[PDB]
Design an enzyme around this catalytic site. Structure first.
Site, PDB file in Angstrom:
ATOM      1  N   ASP A   1       0.672  -1.169   0.210  1.00 49.04           N
ATOM      2  CA  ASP A   1       0.009  -0.075  -0.043  1.00 49.04           C
ATOM      3  C   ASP A   1       0.863   1.169  -0.133  1.00 49.04           C
ATOM      4  O   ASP A   1       0.582   2.299   0.657  1.00 49.04           O
ATOM      5  CB  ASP A   1      -1.080  -0.191   1.075  1.00 49.04           C
ATOM      6  CG  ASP A   1      -2.066   0.883   0.933  1.00 49.04           C
ATOM      7  OD1 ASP A   1      -2.502   1.424  -0.149  1.00 49.04           O
ATOM      8  OD2 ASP A   1      -3.079   0.884   1.927  1.00 49.04           O
TER       9      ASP A   1
HETATM   10  C1  LIG Z   1      -2.299   9.851  -7.977  1.00 45.28           C
HETATM   11  C2  LIG Z   1      -3.554  10.485  -7.260  1.00 45.28           C
HETATM   12  C3  LIG Z   1      -4.603   9.393  -6.824  1.00 45.28           C
HETATM   13  O1  LIG Z   1      -3.863   8.338  -6.154  1.00 45.28           O
HETATM   14  C4  LIG Z   1      -3.625   6.913  -6.588  1.00 45.28           C
HETATM   15  O2  LIG Z   1      -4.027   6.669  -7.546  1.00 45.28           O
HETATM   16  C5  LIG Z   1      -3.109   6.305  -5.362  1.00 45.28           C
HETATM   17  C6  LIG Z   1      -1.541   6.027  -5.745  1.00 45.28           C
HETATM   18  C7  LIG Z   1      -3.948   4.833  -5.243  1.00 45.28           C
HETATM   19  O3  LIG Z   1      -2.818   3.711  -5.004  1.00 45.28           O
HETATM   20  C8  LIG Z   1      -3.093   2.773  -6.164  1.00 45.28           C
HETATM   21  C9  LIG Z   1      -1.818   2.105  -6.122  1.00 45.28           C
HETATM   22  C10 LIG Z   1      -1.990   0.933  -5.279  1.00 45.28           C
HETATM   23  C11 LIG Z   1      -1.121   0.006  -5.310  1.00 45.28           C
HETATM   24  O4  LIG Z   1      -2.436   1.134  -3.824  1.00 45.28           O
HETATM   25  C12 LIG Z   1      -1.309   1.891  -3.174  1.00 45.28           C
HETATM   26  C13 LIG Z   1      -3.428   0.054  -5.503  1.00 45.28           C
HETATM   27  O5  LIG Z   1      -3.725  -1.040  -4.785  1.00 45.28           O
HETATM   28  C14 LIG Z   1      -4.397   0.880  -5.515  1.00 45.28           C
HETATM   29  C15 LIG Z   1      -5.866   0.549  -6.176  1.00 45.28           C
HETATM   30  O6  LIG Z   1      -4.353   2.171  -6.521  1.00 45.28           O
HETATM   31  C16 LIG Z   1      -4.757   4.953  -3.749  1.00 45.28           C
HETATM   32  C17 LIG Z   1      -3.999   5.067  -2.696  1.00 45.28           C
HETATM   33  C18 LIG Z   1      -6.115   4.289  -3.591  1.00 45.28           C
HETATM   34  O7  LIG Z   1      -6.412   3.692  -2.727  1.00 45.28           O
HETATM   35  C19 LIG Z   1      -6.072   2.262  -2.159  1.00 45.28           C
HETATM   36  O8  LIG Z   1      -6.862   1.487  -2.970  1.00 45.28           O
HETATM   37  C20 LIG Z   1      -6.840   0.360  -2.515  1.00 45.28           C
HETATM   38  C21 LIG Z   1      -7.961  -0.539  -3.122  1.00 45.28           C
HETATM   39  C22 LIG Z   1      -7.071   0.008  -1.050  1.00 45.28           C
HETATM   40  C23 LIG Z   1      -5.630   0.577  -0.376  1.00 45.28           C
HETATM   41  N1  LIG Z   1      -5.832   0.557   1.174  1.00 45.28           N
HETATM   42  C24 LIG Z   1      -5.441  -1.036   1.520  1.00 45.28           C
HETATM   43  C25 LIG Z   1      -6.725   1.060   1.834  1.00 45.28           C
HETATM   44  C26 LIG Z   1      -6.086   2.236  -0.974  1.00 45.28           C
HETATM   45  O9  LIG Z   1      -5.106   2.973  -0.123  1.00 45.28           O
HETATM   46  C27 LIG Z   1      -7.289   4.990  -4.119  1.00 45.28           C
HETATM   47  C28 LIG Z   1      -8.298   3.990  -4.392  1.00 45.28           C
HETATM   48  O10 LIG Z   1      -7.171   5.593  -5.563  1.00 45.28           O
HETATM   49  C29 LIG Z   1      -6.942   4.876  -6.753  1.00 45.28           C
HETATM   50  C30 LIG Z   1      -7.628   5.783  -3.358  1.00 45.28           C
HETATM   51  C31 LIG Z   1      -8.944   7.008  -3.697  1.00 45.28           C
HETATM   52  C32 LIG Z   1      -9.057   7.610  -2.365  1.00 45.28           C
HETATM   53  C33 LIG Z   1      -8.830   7.751  -4.849  1.00 45.28           C
HETATM   54  O11 LIG Z   1      -9.296   7.461  -5.752  1.00 45.28           O
HETATM   55  C34 LIG Z   1      -7.769   8.848  -4.953  1.00 45.28           C
HETATM   56  C35 LIG Z   1      -8.839  10.309  -5.101  1.00 45.28           C
HETATM   57  C36 LIG Z   1      -6.823   8.672  -6.015  1.00 45.28           C
HETATM   58  O12 LIG Z   1      -7.535   8.959  -7.298  1.00 45.28           O
HETATM   59  C37 LIG Z   1      -5.501   9.896  -6.217  1.00 45.28           C
HETATM   60  C38 LIG Z   1      -5.265  10.497  -4.722  1.00 45.28           C
HETATM   61  O13 LIG Z   1      -5.989  10.994  -6.578  1.00 45.28           O
HETATM   62 MG   LIG Z   2      -4.787  -0.520   5.849  1.00 49.81          MG
END
Ligand SMILES: CC[C@H]1OC(=O)[C@H](C)[C@@H](O[C@H]2C[C@@](C)(OC)[C@@H](O)[C@H](C)O2)[C@H](C)[C@@H](O[C@@H]2O[C@H](C)C[C@H](N(C)C)[C@H]2O)[C@](C)(OC)C[C@@H](C)C(=O)[C@H](C)[C@@H](O)[C@]1(C)O
Ligand SMILES: [Mg+2]
Ligand SMILES: Nc1nc2c(ncn2[C@@H]2O[C@H](COP(=O)(O)OP(=O)(O)O)[C@@H](O)[C@H]2O)c(=O)[nH]1
Ligand SMILES: [Mg+2]
Length: 296
Positions: free
Chosen positions: A197
């Protein structure tokens, strides 16, 4: 306030004596409410007040991962739960601040998104290279998910079929996913212990944007290390992905010729994680987020 007096009493019961005026609440939290407080030696602590039963079975995997990190890692800090009971989990606060926090959706950034200090990518490369080479085999008892390289590939393949069964997947997107799965050259030949994460809310940085610590290890597992690079790509584009890959490779991390192209395809599979999250949580926006992400 009753909340405050409750925090004080649960801590007191675990030999944690706090400054009442420093106690701040971070709003639950289906699993737990996070509370920040300073003890009477002035040390900052993080408290997790549990909101569900069976804390020990539910935190077992995260604690095993933390034990590996605290035993082996020197380039970065991780939570060290010196209080670990069904009633309370508590660790001394890591140094630094989150590089950015998720809006309570978008990031509130601590760095200049338009001028990312190169030390962020350099230090994160060192941190992940150390992390991903931690010898998790040497543990007598590991209940983490553990993939060989081929198991990591079938896992994704199966997870993708399951999401297609419940939501469907846009035809162009599905064909891309399948092409990635079917490209032997792209897939890594080595796995490792991952954080699972990695994003700005979980990367602690000092004033110079060195990554000095990582919090929240619930997604830890032994699999494709590429998951820990996805944030650099989503937040910083191709430049920040390349900068991270470069530093990881040059400090000794496992590198393969198609690493960048593989990580970019893993990024296009992010709807799989959004779909899976919408399924085990029932939060309405994530279903729409899922469906629109799946191009259905
Ligand atoms: C750039 C900017 C965008 O950031 C991202 O793309 C990150 C790099 C994500 O990590 C990416 C990379 C990733 C590996 O995670 C770190 C991957 O698993 C994830 C799905 O998407 C996030 C942090 C995901 O969360 C993660 O989603 C998981 C389903 C569960 C995780 N946790 C266990 C609660 C949780 O933190 C999330 C869904 O976004 C899309 C969070 C959600 C609040 C949003 O849509 C946000 C508004 C995002 O669009 C953003 C900030 O604008
Ligand atoms: Mg957690
Ligand atoms: N600065 C700092 N913040 C922390 C620390 N631990 C937790 N936090 C903050 O509290 C939030 C929640 O903690 P986390 O471990 O991620 O639990 P969860 O997100 O509620 O499931 C994080 O997003 C951080 O902003 C720490 O050691 N240092
Ligand atoms: Mg978190």
């Amino acid at each position: 306030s009753k909340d405050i007096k409750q925090v004080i009493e649960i801590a007191k019961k675990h030999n944690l004596f706090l400054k009442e005026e420093t106690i701040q609440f971070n709003e639950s939290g289906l699993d737990f409410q996070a509370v920040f407080a300073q003890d009477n030696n002035g040390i900052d602590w993080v408290l997790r007040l549990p909101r569900r039963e069976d804390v020990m079975p539910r935190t077992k995997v995260e604690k095993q991962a933390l034990d590996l990190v605290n035993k082996y890692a020197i380039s970065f800090q991780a939570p060290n739960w010196i209080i670990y009971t069904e009633e309370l989990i508590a660790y001394k606060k890591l140094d630094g601040v989150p590089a950015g926090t998720i809006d309570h959706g978008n990031y509130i950034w601590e760095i200049d998104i338009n001028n990312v200090p190169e030390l962020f990518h350099k230090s994160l490369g060192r941190v992940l290279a150390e992390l991903h080479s931690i010898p998790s085999n040497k543990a007598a008892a590991l209940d983490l998910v553990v993939h060989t390289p081929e198991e990591a590939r079938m896992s994704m393949k199966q997870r993708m079929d399951a999401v297609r069964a419940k939501f469907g997947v846009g035809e162009n997107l599905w064909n891309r996913w399948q092409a990635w799965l079917n490209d032997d050259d792209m897939w890594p030949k080595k796995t490792g212990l991952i954080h699972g994460d990695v994003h700005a809310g979980h990367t602690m940085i000092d004033k110079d944007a060195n990554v000095t610590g990582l919090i929240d290890w619930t997604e830890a597992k032994v699999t494709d290390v590429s998951h820990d690079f996805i944030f650099n790509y989503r937040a910083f584009g191709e430049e920040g992905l390349e900068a991270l890959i470069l530093a990881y490779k040059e400090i000794g991390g496992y590198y393969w010729p198609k690493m960048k192209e593989h990580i970019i395809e893993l990024n296009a599979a992010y709807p799989v994680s959004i779909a899976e999250f919408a399924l085990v949580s029932g939060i309405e926006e994530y279903e729409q987020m899922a469906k629109e992400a799946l191009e259905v």
